[model samples]
Target: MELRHTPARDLDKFIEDHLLPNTCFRTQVKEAIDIVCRFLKERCFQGPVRVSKVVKGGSSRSDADLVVFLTKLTSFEDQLRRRGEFIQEIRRQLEACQREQKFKVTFEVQSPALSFVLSSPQLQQEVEFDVLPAFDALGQWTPGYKPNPEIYVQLIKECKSRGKEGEFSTCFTELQRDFLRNRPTKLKSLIRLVKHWYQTCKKTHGNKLPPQYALELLTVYAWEQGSRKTDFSTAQGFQTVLELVLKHQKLCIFWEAYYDFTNPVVGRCMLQQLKKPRPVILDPADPTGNVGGGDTHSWQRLAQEARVWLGYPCCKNLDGSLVGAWTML
Candidate 1:
């Protein structure tokens, strides 16, 4: 099933103007960007700043129509810290300006990483801004962090196989188009989870993807459900995915109510391991490998270490007795 494509301009006008601009308008947008850039430039650097509030629809709606790009820092930690400080100072100055300028310029920073929305004091308008601290690698920030392309290719192949070249549906053609539409922090976390989950799914399923499994995995961590069929949303999608654990082989997907759910906690730790050189495969008698009789072999050894390593509570026995990987069945 394919989703109907909504143009970027339509969404931009609905969200940025009608829905958001009930309080302030262009002046508010200018103020928010100004504070964000000036504060970062003064504290971080005096180099050229690229500031924009251009409408973007090819990507996620949360793409922070407004964005500020600063010079990159050599040290990653330093860059991260500078990003943090830049946001912090911007908030401080925004409040100060609201009082002196006698206009409301409120802002909220969404979590998991870097993303925010600034509300106009006088109007019901707002501008979502996603800021990224440039890196010294020259566009080589994080490896394995491409979103739309992976899905685009997968969808294209599916359509092409059916002899429907122009039948493929999408809002954005360029990868970057649909990239920032969603909040980066949440998007980044979700992307990481999807990458690892895909690895697990591929390893387990082999050459075949369960119906809507890809979307299900992404939404489970984000924990969103929506009216759509194939594209699962945040919470509902998350719960749907977790339901798979219970269904075993069938794979029942659910969304997590919000991205703040426990999926990422599990994803961040266990997800990475699944991608590493050595993966602990859960099979017939050795699903987890805790001993009914104490098997300390390599498979059994790693199975016992699973709970702590994955940050999940230890799996237990039928009678609620404490056991190891031997009890995986």
Candidate 2:
């Protein structure tokens, strides 16, 4: 497929037209966060529960997650031991609120976290909140740096028993948030486009595919490899990502930005993870997290879709000169 320049101006316009979150919607998300935090403090938790951060995560603004983190227990092991008791208390409080008609919300008790569906006429839209109680493992990660290997060693051990896909992800939310949040603004727009594309594929393929987070990480990897600059040809960047997707079987990607080979424990564990199979893009924050650990059939399906998208008008420029892809590092 001939890659054409995505006009710098057109990329900006496309983002504003389709990708940027609505201001009012974001304001409402903040309000929802406040409500949840207040409820958790005033009703749910009796101890020193602090709302560490309410992150704006997930694919788009409409369905964007309010990932609420609370103060951690003494250790990861402690968090694991008491998580069920903590979640059950929250559920009980939610049920009580429902009975009192304090708010129109539905409760879903997933392991390691309790999800809430907040539907209110006042807000005029349903907002989903995944409240997680986690030990602040990384605390915070500055841009362009790796976290301590000790954090990952703990995570590797945790996954040995509690190896659920997203179960322990919340522990490293600060790092995960910073991973994308610290990227160039234009790159974030690229992530949004890729996420939208993944959503379209999900509708067609259903649960046969990988998680959306995997696609998000893939987009970041493409950008990091192809164009690390704040200003670059979006079409070329997108094409580079699609090319990488088509070559998913040969992907051996990882980031040392947050946890690397300094410690033997972390390095050895990471070696085992990297040796797993194809499409092995290790989660930058959580070393044990192989975001690319999805079925091969799904990647094949998405890779075929990427081929079709390559011919779309979005991949071209006004003058018709092919926009070259970023140099894959």
Candidate 3:
């Protein structure tokens, strides 16, 4: 969607007050994560472990997510073969910390990645950390450069086991981080608004609705289609995203930032994924990820909510003109 005027002052203040997290709170969580990472290095983890921050795109909630990459795996095959053993070792190491009562740690084994939640009553905060045993698949990628699709071909081959739907999801975590993190600040703020609305839907619908990430992708896609500028009307941006939600079934979005229609293997795999169903926005980083895999009923419910929201004052101008959506490029 498009807008002719900047967001009103009161609306901007509302976002500033509600969407942005306090600076001190952000710092506290990051520090807690650093401490936990250091402990893993000295006590549990073997081989070289590189600890880095990965900023998941969209609004700044849960901004303290960290990726602990194990540097031992030199080849993709090595990562594939030793995946289970490596995760087990990390889990064992975490058990030591759990026994020490270091920040109330809980391991999640059923997830695609070896992840643990760290909650510190001392800090009054919690952060989920994903421990990735990755092979640095896209080693040293320059900003905005597209790598060969062969790596993805190998990634697809390795995940043939049905149980590992998104087993290699973390392999391209960096790509996903970069894809949306570098967007214009105003666009990110728009993401925050959309996410807050999605949260509202969740409170009403519970787990029956779609994953938050799908809505995040829908927001990004709406921005790309409606307005690619650093500055735009917030009301219009929000409206555009809701409009896309209304049309979720016909949506087919993908990005060429990493892999594209080239390479026979990658191309064939992508075709299969695209044809699965509606709202197919493939993960720009990992082709195996269908970020838009939500049920028709969920989309319908969310669309109805969006329509109701459009009538709210936030989606309209003081002059009573409805904010227009951006023209598809």
Candidate 4:
């Protein structure tokens, strides 16, 4: 019940102790992910489908745990146009695994992801698999590689055509994971802390807050703009995110790592997107996405929550002084 506030100095130990998943469970999730990858590759994808890669989300803590990149068909348009049948056939394949009692699992179809729960003897608790049937956008993925700018151009045009923004975020799993996965471990820890604070918000507010990914991106933006160190203060970074959340109306953050303003067409489109409204967190992987764009008032209560948290002991230092938030402008 009292997981809300931790004194500034104790956050490091608190995250180490309570927040990060235990190594044993992480190992099981890895082994389970691998087993699922093999079973998916060998037995499931029989109909012109081959798995390019299975990327476990970096934190492996929350949100879209496993994104399975499918190949051979389901191109950009087909993935969207044929998304209905594609998921149908994919579900058909999973039923085959279930029929043989391979593993105790049950899954349901989300719009684009197959959300599943797998419970095995090796697993002490149930594990979630947000298996995305993605088009391998990053053909050759790397820490040093960036997607072609035209890909983003095509992405914007397609989503505009469909009147859906960020529908294909699942397709760019490689980029999305690497966006945070490549960051320093300590930065990841700060995200973990913010997520912990977010948990408190969710428990109280239910389904009223803005999208969680928006907060994740804010943490990254805050760290990059404010902290910018491999080993920085978690308390400061955490408050910095809160500060931005409080001033979310003016938040417009984007990354040029994948696609920048260099290309005229893409450049113009993104400029228009940037010009749309405030609190625009352009998904670095997908320019079409304005995360937390919906329900503009969602952040209102969240900002109040952040304000309350600012007064908590977590935002204060040892001498009972201000821990001080970073300047994110």
Candidate 5:
């Protein structure tokens, strides 16, 4: 696989100049945050999405991550209206700010984890900013709303403590970034589960896999349901998922909890498992041969177990898609 350059360097620069100072960056970042809130209020809604708990500098020598805690307007229609209007407003804000040639920005949102960028125009300057807008049912700040610095500080301290105890992998970041960029967008749910499992592993075992067993287990299940194209036991692909869980811990957490209907808070049960070190034994793979299109790998396996894993064979003359040993009619 080719190594692609991720434009995180720009964010690195932003960290040095603004976040390092600590004092100055807050005001500057807040101005930008308030501008967004005010912009959203006037153009998108009449009132500002309350901004609280402004965070700066969790990543070392890295630009600060900004979180905007806000609420959606009443009624699905008003909230929907605000969401649409907010997108256009973001573009307008960037276009207007570009004249300064200070930073380039990108926009993204996935409910609870809205993210994107702001970075220097020149490579030499190497400054960048990460803005995360976390929204909820009400536009207000509560105890747990964003990926705040406390979480970051604890993670770093955890890693360091584990390192001192000689428990975790030194190469964790390698697995994290690789997974972040290369993870198959197709098996998103499985990706989430695997992450959750690994976090559980880390929290218990101090970051070392018992054997590469988790990867093998995950790939076997993925392959059984046609989620994986490669062989179930292939060492190559099996390692890929494991590499991701270790390297990109937060990405895995986001992937798993993003879909849960129950309100998700970090350092809680599902979220906290990622920090432990132990293997999670899931149900053994179903022997059924069918592949069912579904939200999670487990669901597809269940579908296959029930002889419902596939649709009509893409080829003619087949009775139905194969489900374990049975053929679906």
Candidate 6:
């Protein structure tokens, strides 16, 4: 007298069909970036720029992120001060190149991050690109490389004096990339699942949901504290994140991979950062940033959906009992 209980395969198929972006979107996106890369090499004043990809929210969509590092930018402050001109120049070049180079694309200019959609004759769906410019804070990185504490101290010093917490994360792109790039494969799949869940809310309730990056950090935090193993129960991981959403009112998360609560100066700075607001999730790379900061209402809206999802089949074990979520008090 038992109906089918949800299994791991059930949840996995949901991710594959429901959330994953299709392959053609990916192939086309790659095709467009190829042109973007070539154009930058020949046209941009920063001749030998290095490009990298970053993970953001809403993976169900057809979009990609690329952070183009320029050698002309010697300092973080240098990038911050003259950043707009660099962006405008790049945009100007892109506008001309999209046509001259036989690529069919349209440029959507958004400050801080550039957006564009690609269209080809066979293109069934539109693909997007978030081309960001950054200072070359790193060339090649070694594994488990711990940065000097003074650099962070000075980073805090400069941000305090100059006062733009948001822009600095891109400057330390090296650390940001390393922090996430080395995760386990299964954990990466879990992030894809969580991203789909975030998009689910986005479609239903509109854009009032919290930043996708917030959910990313929460998924990471849950994994870090939940099992500390490569293989984990995906349902339990799902439930762990949903449970944390319920605790958004008390959410204050960070990491000490690079800078810890030692060194009197760093300790003092981190203490103040933690004191900023509730539902705080700072970038592990940049202490100044609150990736999903000052958005209590957003998380409140998102948590309601999470609460409902907790009762769904996906959050249930094969025995039909609730998959107990991880607790981090």
User: Model-by-model lDDT, in order?
Assistant: 0.33, 0.68, 0.66, 0.73, 0.31, 0.70
| TM per candidate | 0.28, 0.77, 0.74, 0.85, 0.27, 0.77
lDDT by residue for model 1 (113-165), tens: 35566675555455566544432222222222433223234323433355432
Q: What number of backbone clashes does candidate 4 have, counting pairs of residues 3 or more apart or in separate chains?
A: 0
Task: Give one clash count per candidate, in the order shown.
Answer: 56, 5, 5, 0, 38, 0
The candidate scoring highest on TM-score is 4
Question: Which regions of candidate 4 are displaced past 4 Å?
Answer: 48-50, 57-63, 72-77, 92-113, 118-124, 318-320
lDDT of 6 by residue, 75-105 (tens): 5787656767667767776676775766444
Pairs clashing within candidate 3: 1-325, 1-326, 2-324, 2-325, 2-326
Screening candidate 2 with a backbone cut-off below 3 angstroms (N, C-alpha, C), the clashing residue pairs are: 3-323, 4-323, 5-323, 146-257, 147-258
What does candidate 6 score on TM? 0.77
Against the true structure, whose lDDT is highest? Answer: 4
Candidate with more favorable, higher lDDT: 2 or 5: 2
Whole-model lDDT, model 3: 0.66
Give one digit per residue, the lDDT tens place, for model 5 in 56-110.
3222223434433334333223323354454444444434444432422322222
TM-score of 1: 0.28
Looking at model 1, residue 308 earns an lDDT score of 30
Candidate 2 residue 27 Cα shift, in angstroms, is: 3.8
Candidates, ranked, TM-score: 4, 2, 6, 3, 1, 5
Global lDDT for candidate 6?
Answer: 0.70
lDDT tens string, model 4, 1-329? 25455788888888898777657766655765676666666665564666666677533324445766677663566666666665666666555545553433333334445666654445445566665567776667667766887777777777788777787787786787778778899998888888778876887885588777788888999988987889988888887888889888888789987888888877877787788767788888888888777667788888999998888888788687868888754
